[PDB]
């Protein structure tokens, strides 16, 4: 019960690098701000897809927040 909720955002453009910033930082901003687990998967070819997983609404909030703001 409770487990951990996850979701993948269909990304493509240079979102990862932009998000991770220098060497990955934003991933922590949300992971802490939204108490979620946002991770940027490297090595891409055709399409991109970030992995987001948390528990409370935070995971779904940060998820949609990225797909929209993608800050």
DSSP state of 34: T
Ramachandran bin of 2, using left for φ above 0, alpha for ψ from -120 to 50, beta for the remaining angles: left
Q: How many residues does the chain have?
A: 71
Q: What is the 3-state secondary structure (H, E, C) of 39-66?
A: ECCCCCCCCEEEEEEECCHHHHHHHHHH
CA–CA dist 51, 65 (Å, integer)? 14
Elucidation method: NMR
Domains of the chain (ranges; CATH) run: 1-71 (3.30.1370.10)
Ramachandran bin of 47, using left for φ above 0, alpha for ψ from -120 to 50, beta for the remaining angles: beta
Q: Please give the radius of gyration of the chain, using alpha carbons only, rounded to the nearest integer.
A: 12
Name the one residue in this structure whose structure tokens are 């979102």. 15
Name the one residue in this structure whose structure tokens are 């453009």. 13
């Amino acid at each position: 019960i409770n487990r951990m909720d996850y979701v993948e955002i269909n990304i493509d453009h240079k979102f990862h690098r932009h998000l991770i910033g220098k060497s990955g930082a934003n991933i922590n901003r949300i992971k802490d701000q939204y108490k979620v687990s946002v991770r940027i998967p490297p090595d891409s070819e055709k399409s991109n897809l970030i992995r987001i997983e948390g528990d409370p609404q935070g995971v779904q909030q940060a998820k949609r927040e990225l797909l929209e703001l993608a800050s």
